[PDB]
Amino acid sequence: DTFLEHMCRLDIDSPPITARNTGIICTIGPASRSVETLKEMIKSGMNVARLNFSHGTHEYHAETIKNVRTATESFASDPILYRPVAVALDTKGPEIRTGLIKEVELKKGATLKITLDNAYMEKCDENILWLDYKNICKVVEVGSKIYVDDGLISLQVKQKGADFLVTEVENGGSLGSKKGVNLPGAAVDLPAVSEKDIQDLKFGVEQDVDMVFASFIRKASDVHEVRKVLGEKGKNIKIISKIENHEGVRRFDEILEASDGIMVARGDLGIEIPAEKVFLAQKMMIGRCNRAGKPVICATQMLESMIKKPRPTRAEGSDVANAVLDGADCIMLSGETAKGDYPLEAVRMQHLIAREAEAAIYHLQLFEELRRLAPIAADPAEATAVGAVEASFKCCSGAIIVLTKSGRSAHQVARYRPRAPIIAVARNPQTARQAHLYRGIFPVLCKDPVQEAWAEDVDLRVNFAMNVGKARGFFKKGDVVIVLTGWRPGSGFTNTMRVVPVP
Amino acid sequence: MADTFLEHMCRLDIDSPPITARNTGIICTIGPASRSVETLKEMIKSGMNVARLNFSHGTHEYHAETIKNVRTATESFASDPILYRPVAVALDTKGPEIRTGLIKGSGTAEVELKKGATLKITLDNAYMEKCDENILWLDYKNICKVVEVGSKIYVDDGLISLQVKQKGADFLVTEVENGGSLGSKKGVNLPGAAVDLPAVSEKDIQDLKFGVEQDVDMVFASFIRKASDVHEVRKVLGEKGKNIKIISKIENHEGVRRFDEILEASDGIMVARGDLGIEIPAEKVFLAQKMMIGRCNRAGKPVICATQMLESMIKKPRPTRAEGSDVANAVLDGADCIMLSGETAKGDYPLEAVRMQHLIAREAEAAIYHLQLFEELRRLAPADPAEATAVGAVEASFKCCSGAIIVLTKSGRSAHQVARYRPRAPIIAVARNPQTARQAHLYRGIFPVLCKDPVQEAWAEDVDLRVNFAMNVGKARGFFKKGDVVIVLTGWRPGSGFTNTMRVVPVP
Amino acid sequence: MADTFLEHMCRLDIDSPPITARNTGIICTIGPASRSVETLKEMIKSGMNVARLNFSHGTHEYHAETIKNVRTATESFASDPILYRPVAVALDTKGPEIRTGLIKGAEVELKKGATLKITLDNAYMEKCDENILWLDYKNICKVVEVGSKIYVDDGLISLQVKQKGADFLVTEVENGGSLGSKKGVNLPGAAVDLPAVSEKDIQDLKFGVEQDVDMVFASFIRKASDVHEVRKVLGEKGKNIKIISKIENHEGVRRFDEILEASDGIMVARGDLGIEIPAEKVFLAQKMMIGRCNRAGKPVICATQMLESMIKKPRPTRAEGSDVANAVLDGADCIMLSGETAKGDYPLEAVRMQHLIAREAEAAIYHLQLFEELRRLAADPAEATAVGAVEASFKCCSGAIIVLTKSGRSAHQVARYRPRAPIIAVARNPQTARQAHLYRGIFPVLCKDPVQEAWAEDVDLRVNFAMNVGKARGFFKKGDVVIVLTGWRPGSGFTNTMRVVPVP
Amino acid sequence: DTFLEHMCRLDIDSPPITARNTGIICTIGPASRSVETLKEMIKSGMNVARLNFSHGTHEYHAETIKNVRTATESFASDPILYRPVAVALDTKGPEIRTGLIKGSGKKGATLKITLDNAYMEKCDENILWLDYKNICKVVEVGSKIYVDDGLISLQVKQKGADFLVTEVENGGSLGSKKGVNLPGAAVDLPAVSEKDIQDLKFGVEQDVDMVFASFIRKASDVHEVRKVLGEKGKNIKIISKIENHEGVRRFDEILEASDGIMVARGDLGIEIPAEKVFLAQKMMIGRCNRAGKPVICATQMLESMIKKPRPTRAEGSDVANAVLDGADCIMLSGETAKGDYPLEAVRMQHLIAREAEAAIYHLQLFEELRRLAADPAEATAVGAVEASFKCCSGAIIVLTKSGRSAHQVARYRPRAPIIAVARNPQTARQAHLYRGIFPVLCKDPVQEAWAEDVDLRVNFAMNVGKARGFFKKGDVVIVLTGWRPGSGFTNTMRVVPVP
Numbered sequence A: 001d002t003f004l005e006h007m008c009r010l011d012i013d014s015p016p017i018t019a020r021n022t023g024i025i026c027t028i029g030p031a032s033r034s035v036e037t038l039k040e041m042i043k044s045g046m047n048v049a050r051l052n053f054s055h056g057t058h059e060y061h062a063e064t065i066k067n068v069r070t071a072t073e074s075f076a077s078d079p080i081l082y083r084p085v086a087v088a089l090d091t092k093g094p095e096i097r098t099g100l101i102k103e104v105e106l107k108k109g110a111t112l113k114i115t116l117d118n119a120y121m122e123k124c125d126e127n128i129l130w131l132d133y134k135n136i137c138k139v140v141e142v143g144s145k146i147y148v149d150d151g152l153i154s155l156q157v158k159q160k161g162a163d164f165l166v167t168e169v170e171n172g173g174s175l176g177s178k179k180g181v182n183l184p185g186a187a188v189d190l191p192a193v194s195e196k197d198i199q200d201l202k203f204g205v206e207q208d209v210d211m212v213f214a215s216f217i218r219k220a221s222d223v224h225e226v227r228k229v230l231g232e233k234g235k236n237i238k239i240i241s242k243i244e245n246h247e248g249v250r251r252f253d254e255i256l257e258a259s260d261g262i263m264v265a266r267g268d269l270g271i272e273i274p275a276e277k278v279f280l281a282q283k284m285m286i287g288r289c290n291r292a293g294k295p296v297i298c299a300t301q302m303l304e305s306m307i308k309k310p311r312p313t314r315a316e317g318s319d320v321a322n323a324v325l326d327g328a329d330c331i332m333l334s335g336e337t338a339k340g341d342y343p344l345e346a347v348r349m350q351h352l353i354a355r356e357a358e359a360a361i362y363h364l365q366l367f368e369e370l371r372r373l374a375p376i377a378a379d380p381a382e383a384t385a386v387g388a389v390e391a392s393f394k395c396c397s398g399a400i401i402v403l404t405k406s407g408r409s410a411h412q413v414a415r416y417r418p419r420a421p422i423i424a425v426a427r428n429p430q431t432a433r434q435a436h437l438y439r440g441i442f443p444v445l446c447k448d449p450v451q452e453a454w455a456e457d458v459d460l461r462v463n464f465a466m467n468v469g470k471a472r473g474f475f476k477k478g479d480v481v482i483v484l485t486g487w488r489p490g491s492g493f494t495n496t497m498r499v500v501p502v503p
Numbered sequence B: 001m002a003d004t005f006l007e008h009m010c011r012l013d014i015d016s017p018p019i020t021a022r023n024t025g026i027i028c029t030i031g032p033a034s035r036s037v038e039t040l041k042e043m044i045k046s047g048m049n050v051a052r053l054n055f056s057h058g059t060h061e062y063h064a065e066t067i068k069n070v071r072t073a074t075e076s077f078a079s080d081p082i083l084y085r086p087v088a089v090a091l092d093t094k095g096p097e098i099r100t101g102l103i104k105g106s107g108t109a110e111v112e113l114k115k116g117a118t119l120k121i122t123l124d125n126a127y128m129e130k131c132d133e134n135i136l137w138l139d140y141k142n143i144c145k146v147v148e149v150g151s152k153i154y155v156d157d158g159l160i161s162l163q164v165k166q167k168g169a170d171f172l173v174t175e176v177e178n179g180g181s182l183g184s185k186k187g188v189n190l191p192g193a194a195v196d197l198p199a200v201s202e203k204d205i206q207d208l209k210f211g212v213e214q215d216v217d218m219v220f221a222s223f224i225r226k227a228s229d230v231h232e233v234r235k236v237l238g239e240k241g242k243n244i245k246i247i248s249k250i251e252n253h254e255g256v257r258r259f260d261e262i263l264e265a266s267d268g269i270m271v272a273r274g275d276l277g278i279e280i281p282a283e284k285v286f287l288a289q290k291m292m293i294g295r296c297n298r299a300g301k302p303v304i305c306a307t308q309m310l311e312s313m314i315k316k317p318r319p320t321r322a323e324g325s326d327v328a329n330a331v332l333d334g335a336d337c338i339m340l341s342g343e344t345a346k347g348d349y350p351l352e353a354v355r356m357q358h359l360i361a362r363e364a365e366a367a368i369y370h371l372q373l374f375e376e377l378r379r380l381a382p383a384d385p386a387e388a389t390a391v392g393a394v395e396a397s398f399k400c401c402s403g404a405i406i407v408l409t410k411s412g413r414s415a416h417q418v419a420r421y422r423p424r425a426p427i428i429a430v431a432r433n434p435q436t437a438r439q440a441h442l443y444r445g446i447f448p449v450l451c452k453d454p455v456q457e458a459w460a461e462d463v464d465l466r467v468n469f470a471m472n473v474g475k476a477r478g479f480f481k482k483g484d485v486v487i488v489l490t491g492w493r494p495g496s497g498f499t500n501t502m503r504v505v506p507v508p
Numbered sequence C: 001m002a003d004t005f006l007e008h009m010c011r012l013d014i015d016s017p018p019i020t021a022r023n024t025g026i027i028c029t030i031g032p033a034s035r036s037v038e039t040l041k042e043m044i045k046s047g048m049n050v051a052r053l054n055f056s057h058g059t060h061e062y063h064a065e066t067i068k069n070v071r072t073a074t075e076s077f078a079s080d081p082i083l084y085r086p087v088a089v090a091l092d093t094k095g096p097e098i099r100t101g102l103i104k105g106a107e108v109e110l111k112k113g114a115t116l117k118i119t120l121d122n123a124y125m126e127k128c129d130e131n132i133l134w135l136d137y138k139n140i141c142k143v144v145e146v147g148s149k150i151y152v153d154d155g156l157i158s159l160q161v162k163q164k165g166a167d168f169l170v171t172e173v174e175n176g177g178s179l180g181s182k183k184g185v186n187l188p189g190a191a192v193d194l195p196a197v198s199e200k201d202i203q204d205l206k207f208g209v210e211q212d213v214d215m216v217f218a219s220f221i222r223k224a225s226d227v228h229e230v231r232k233v234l235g236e237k238g239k240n241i242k243i244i245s246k247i248e249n250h251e252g253v254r255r256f257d258e259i260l261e262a263s264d265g266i267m268v269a270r271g272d273l274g275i276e277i278p279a280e281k282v283f284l285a286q287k288m289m290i291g292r293c294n295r296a297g298k299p300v301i302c303a304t305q306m307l308e309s310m311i312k313k314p315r316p317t318r319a320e321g322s323d324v325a326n327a328v329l330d331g332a333d334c335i336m337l338s339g340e341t342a343k344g345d346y347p348l349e350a351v352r353m354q355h356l357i358a359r360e361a362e363a364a365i366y367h368l369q370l371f372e373e374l375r376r377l378a379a380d381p382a383e384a385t386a387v388g389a390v391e392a393s394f395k396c397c398s399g400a401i402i403v404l405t406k407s408g409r410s411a412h413q414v415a416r417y418r419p420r421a422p423i424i425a426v427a428r429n430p431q432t433a434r435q436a437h438l439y440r441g442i443f444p445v446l447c448k449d450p451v452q453e454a455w456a457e458d459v460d461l462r463v464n465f466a467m468n469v470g471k472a473r474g475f476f477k478k479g480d481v482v483i484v485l486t487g488w489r490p491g492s493g494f495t496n497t498m499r500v501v502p503v504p
Numbered sequence D: 001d002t003f004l005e006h007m008c009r010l011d012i013d014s015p016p017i018t019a020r021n022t023g024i025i026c027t028i029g030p031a032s033r034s035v036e037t038l039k040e041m042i043k044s045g046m047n048v049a050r051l052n053f054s055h056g057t058h059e060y061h062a063e064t065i066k067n068v069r070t071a072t073e074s075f076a077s078d079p080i081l082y083r084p085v086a087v088a089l090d091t092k093g094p095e096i097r098t099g100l101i102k103g104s105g106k107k108g109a110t111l112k113i114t115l116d117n118a119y120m121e122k123c124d125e126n127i128l129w130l131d132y133k134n135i136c137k138v139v140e141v142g143s144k145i146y147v148d149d150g151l152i153s154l155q156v157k158q159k160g161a162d163f164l165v166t167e168v169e170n171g172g173s174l175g176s177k178k179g180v181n182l183p184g185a186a187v188d189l190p191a192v193s194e195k196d197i198q199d200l201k202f203g204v205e206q207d208v209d210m211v212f213a214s215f216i217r218k219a220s221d222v223h224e225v226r227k228v229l230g231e232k233g234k235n236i237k238i239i240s241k242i243e244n245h246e247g248v249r250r251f252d253e254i255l256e257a258s259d260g261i262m263v264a265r266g267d268l269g270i271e272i273p274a275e276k277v278f279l280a281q282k283m284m285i286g287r288c289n290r291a292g293k294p295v296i297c298a299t300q301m302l303e304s305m306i307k308k309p310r311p312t313r314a315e316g317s318d319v320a321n322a323v324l325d326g327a328d329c330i331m332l333s334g335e336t337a338k339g340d341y342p343l344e345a346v347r348m349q350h351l352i353a354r355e356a357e358a359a360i361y362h363l364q365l366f367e368e369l370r371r372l373a374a375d376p377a378e379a380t381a382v383g384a385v386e387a388s389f390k391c392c393s394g395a396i397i398v399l400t401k402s403g404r405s406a407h408q409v410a411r412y413r414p415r416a417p418i419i420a421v422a423r424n425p426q427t428a429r430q431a432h433l434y435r436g437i438f439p440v441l442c443k444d445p446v447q448e449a450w451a452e453d454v455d456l457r458v459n460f461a462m463n464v465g466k467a468r469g470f471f472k473k474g475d476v477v478i479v480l481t482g483w484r485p486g487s488g489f490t491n492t493m494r495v496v497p498v499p
């Protein structure tokens, strides 16, 4: 009844009892591409496979996607135990790159002039450096820092020109070729969708991906440019906006209102804004996502140590758990599953931490705040969704069963953070897969034929859900579940709630 | 102020500075980087509240002089009592440590232990100064009696790990699991070994008697596993040391299993996260930390988070994003104090580490929803006159948007009682006793000030003078200004009584 | 909508019409003044929900005709089913009454200090004056002793026994007043122990079964076993008739819990309680019994000393208005009118005044607190949906909760939790339609339409019926929202289906 | 707990456990004005003596006041047991009277209202006079006119220069010089009559505690009374009587102007439909409780007890409901002034109001009154009441100068009694206007040292509470005092064990 008493009763020497409710997203690459590893990653709890289009060809990604689907459909022969697995396309997005040295040393002792003049784009050195961002000179000033190679080189602009910068180095070191630059000042005006991104996104539509992780989102109009490129054929593809610099954090509200969800890229924010502040930015963006009922993913610097070790550090378990407790919907693994020595061990550990963290979630408190921050009255569907969550607490329910076309009704229930799992029963395979983005939704794909009597159809899907719930040990005979259904086909939105005994 | 925890998170702004003070204590380990009068002065100005001496190293003479330097730097500010910050001295015991020997030769300094290599562990004294890739001496004579084939051995705060492949009479052959650079005299952990070293050794008796002799404010008692360990320390401190606070360090699994009895015997707790990471997996340590902070917050006993704080700042002038987040989350869990180790003791940026610890603790204060902490700490309490007065002072602090709660205190008890309930407003604890002003730093939200003026014959005039002093301090630290309200807590009439007196006074 | 009760009292305006429906039921006693088809029609129009027949007086033949007149008057509205108002019939039992006889040949005044003789001799039974009094309790001489006390005319007169005489009793008039023919008599401190169910009550209860009454008001209930005797007499044929136990004495109050748990509901008879319980206490018994009834979700009727001035006057006193309003504010489901409608000169006027007061009192009910408290003093699938439906009626500022019910249980379950919004209960069973008037906030409507083949179709027709009733009654208009509760399948046990439906 | 569980737990066979916390005001007249009866009414719980200046000469009222003070001071020898007793002056106020001669004079009839001063003492069931000049200027077609105690209703058809044309609506006998009420009508009569001015100045000279100002219709009537009481009478409490529709309409500005309010239900019931007065009563008590101003319920309380030694069920229920509505005080009129059972009427008022206390859910009142920090004063008051609940204290002890501190605590409606220790006798008397204040008069000399003077007054309250059965040794009380001699408010809170 008190958060403090929940913390006081935490017991490291008893196994975690509540289900993992947060999604696991795994970057698939060389170490994890193979069908056999992919099957093991699915059984160990991967919900979403991420393809990082910063590297690899279309051919290479097509085969990864084929292995992901082969590994996923290997479990299809049991509809009660089959777990849907979503496919995520993560774009390269806009970059600023230095181009070719003829590496070199660097210290303040010599000033570094930055030039954009294409006749210098292969003769980079400690005296003159080339940059591929033609419009740099408009968006920087004489106070502004310039980070080179993932923040290990910092500069400080002293003379701004029309098409040149005079800097002087801080935090010097070993500058090499084609290194990534960051401008903490920000308001960079690079397109939003690079030439490669438009091809990549078209391939995404053809490969039938469930969602896009759109890199370097700075404003609402970037999200709407990705939407427009995905076009009419891609309109049901979820757009997750990646927040990676200071301007994204500052314009968070317009990006959130434009997006299907959000990814917080902590390592990227680590470069752009001070370390004493990134934790506030993460707690802020997760809170605003929770309030809006929109999925938020925490990404980068999760279990990096597990690229080379089979167990993570104390600090990594704490950072991952504290992301769950901030209210993240999903946690994403990068190199730990893409290229590291322990891909399967990485998935298993992400699972153990997210599950252990559930002990420290106080569900009723999240609900009471989230219910009080809802509109004054809202539509019918909202009143019903909140009513189903309220009922779930007051009957100590095993689950909330939601029959959904698009997932919207399941999504509405999830925003309110019931303790009870949301078993989202869907015939649409894409909405089954997209559902993994949301804390506390367990999607199941009903393949049964559409009955002709609607009340018979509903009864079959609910029976399906009852069977899934029993097999997963969410509940058993004598328990009560909430059920949310539409009324007759002919009406709009799931506006119908029953409290039903588990037969 | 915001009605929900959620709305409080939603309003966090990285672009606007903090509007709360830094309410958590900063404990800094003093070592070769930091023990100069010059450095200590800067460190006090930048937020250091407690100076920690690590008696794992150094002579009594070395530490006498560090203490001397701490007090010289501290009293250099005594000239203006409105600006004087009390600074406590903590003595951190060796305890039952295992240490490796000295690296041989003159042409390595450190050796590289590599994945899969064989390493022999010897107790043969002929090797205590000839350690290398192949032979490692350590100083725990009965190691071969408490270890088995398969047993894990951890060296240098967990950075190197070994597994015992063969056992001998007076040696162990081991396989390097986790490689690393092994230097001289590193710390060794034997998870699930029944290490038979005593809680209080003869050296620990001598260290604790020297703390009493040097008038230290608090003892950080290393490797506490049970209450009789705490009792043993309290007995060595004896009658002369009866006002010295004992902070029990939880460093292992047994310390966590027997936590309640350790808490009940202790004045406070230090959570050693790194050391817990050796006997306890990563998917479980965050839970240990949250449980022990919560139980401490519930008992009203000070709790310090230590180890693995800003260790990157040993070599760099700025921390990582992960360290900021980890320190912030220890504040948000309800830690009273944060302790720095090598970052201040021996590193290249001791002053930049104190400043960064202050910056992070101050930013973290913006994510604390004080009202919820208070309402929960109020509910979970049973109810003497002193306690209802303190809860009333805290409730009033919130209702009045108080700039502070001024507490006139002899022992510190009344200031501690108020701090237990986690007001938003700073607690200015006005003490005439220099030891209670120093010890007050163990508690979240207490800003101790030492009143140096003599006692007036007239009680009510003595109270106004002391309250006038607090109001000058609060004005100068920018806690409040003319036209704000403060809560004042005092006794009624001279003579040891209940601090039962609450007033709401407008700030002139 | 007020954050606090206090604000809610502060915002009361005497000058602005009422913005809520009249939610409490009106029970009217039908007698010579109110018997006629014509009056009954007018009383139904002015808000009479229940017709009470007092079997303390009259023949089975006489009451047969009153019931016929009520049903004629009621069935005259049937032709528009949107406007038809169910009207229940109640049978109020004699029970173990003690009554004085007839004045000799005019009335007599009993003046303080005087002697008054009570005689067993049936000679004087139609000869009662200032000096001698007959009463109809044959054992009166055997059940009192010198010092014993005796009350008359309901109240107002008090007598102390000075001499006992085998077939006579000599008393002294402690309290005076006028003395009427056939008046009521009380004997506190004497084991009267006349049965709760006499031979005449048996006959009257069997008659009520025959005449298809909706409910029985059982007089002088003192314990659980008295209720079970009434229940037995109604037997199998009368099993769906609602028993309302009248609490009329100190034993009823002391044994309240076992009576409540044995009964379908409770009638608080304030005047009768006033006789053995002092004035400093009766308001506490009234408030306790209404509270416990609200707690148990059982109907509670407040009766006696309501609008008794309106027997002789076209208007009530301010004290009467305040006393009725406070019974409503206490949480009464129904208000009963007695002599005001039975025999007085202003039957229609007393019905209209009862509607005005009850409607104006609704302004001062703090619904949000009642629901929060009844919710906190409560889960079952049945209970969760009902509570959910009331919670949604607040959140959506709904115009009504529409409930499809067979027996009425689902409607009663919603009513226990006390929504602001009216409950339109749609029945096909005319008895459940009638019985639903015992519950605060239920507006019952009778669906005449035949059952549709397809279950979902039939549900949507009934809902659209309630939708049309609500609109005609001004509860809601197009594009307001309402809550709807149904069963799931044709035979689905539990009305467990909740929707929030726009008003078309 | 819930309010519902509170009603459910009520038990009529359980003796009342808690003290009566509402004030009792008794009208003193021929049946009650002897020193002997006054002594008994004070022992039985009378807190305020009301003098009705509608009748009696100044000589008569001066002797009643003298007897009230003789009776009160007869208990002065034991300061632990002495109950302060307040004196209230209740003004005649502006009336409208008919004016006839001879013995006396039933629907229809057609009555004509002449103002023509011809018919001063010559009127009948055709022509009726009255002394209100402007009656024809503030009335229209449809207007009601009541005569006697609303016994007879008229209906104005036609309106002219100096006359009216009406229709008898209710029938009865028409006596001489009988009161006249104008429903929904904005009467422009002077607010303070020439008798009221005399009567108010007599009140100042007699050192009365409070005035009950009759027929208050607007803020400016309250200001007019305040100006007559003047500087000499500035410390006299003005209670505005709400007796008609305009008073109800313009309540917010009358309350802001006034020290407190009297709801005159019987007079409201003439000016206003009977089925609306309970709303008016509940509204004004709620608004008074919100402003922290005393509210008194008056008229139609225990009227049966004029002739009978016990009240009716209806009367018991109407008094109890006035207490449960949030009334600070209940007033008796004829029951104590002129009827046959004046002592019994006081005792029954105590019993009813004490039994009603069982039905008050204290924490709810407080929690709502807190929700609806002005200054350090308000912060100390709220925190005192909070502490009284947490520590389950037997009292809140307030060392009061003006009594403002005590009144500030009483607003938030603690369960625990407020023992208001006053050295100022008028402060002790005026405190009775507030629910839940038990005022005590300290008669000890001021001690040289402020801290010893405080300890003395607290020890005095501690002995009072022990005697009264409020608490016993080892209980806890909340103590509010000033800080230092002459501080502007009771700003200092202690939780102190009862020794």
Ligand SMILES: N[C@@H](Cc1ccccc1)C(=O)O
Residues within 6 Å of the ligand: A019, A020, A021, A022, A023, A024, A047, A421, A422, A435, A436, A438, A439, A440, A441, A442, A443
């Ligand atoms: N969506 C994830 C997480 C989850 C588990 C259990 C319940 C709800 C959600 C899954 O399907 O496995």
Ligand SMILES: N[C@@H](Cc1ccccc1)C(=O)O
Residues within 6 Å of the ligand: D019, D020, D021, D022, D023, D024, D045, D047, D417, D418, D431, D432, D435, D436, D437, D438, D439
């Ligand atoms: N003021 C009244 C009422 C009261 C009694 C007891 C306690 C509180 C108030 C009195 O002193 O009698």
Ligand SMILES: [K+]
Residues within 6 Å of the ligand: A052, A053, A054, A090, A091, A092, A093, A215
């Ligand atoms: K990418």
Ligand SMILES: [K+]
Residues within 6 Å of the ligand: B054, B055, B056, B092, B093, B094, B095, B222
């Ligand atoms: K140490």
Ligand SMILES: [K+]
Residues within 6 Å of the ligand: C054, C055, C056, C092, C093, C094, C095, C219
């Ligand atoms: K009867």
Ligand SMILES: [K+]
Residues within 6 Å of the ligand: D052, D053, D054, D090, D091, D092, D093, D214
């Ligand atoms: K008067």
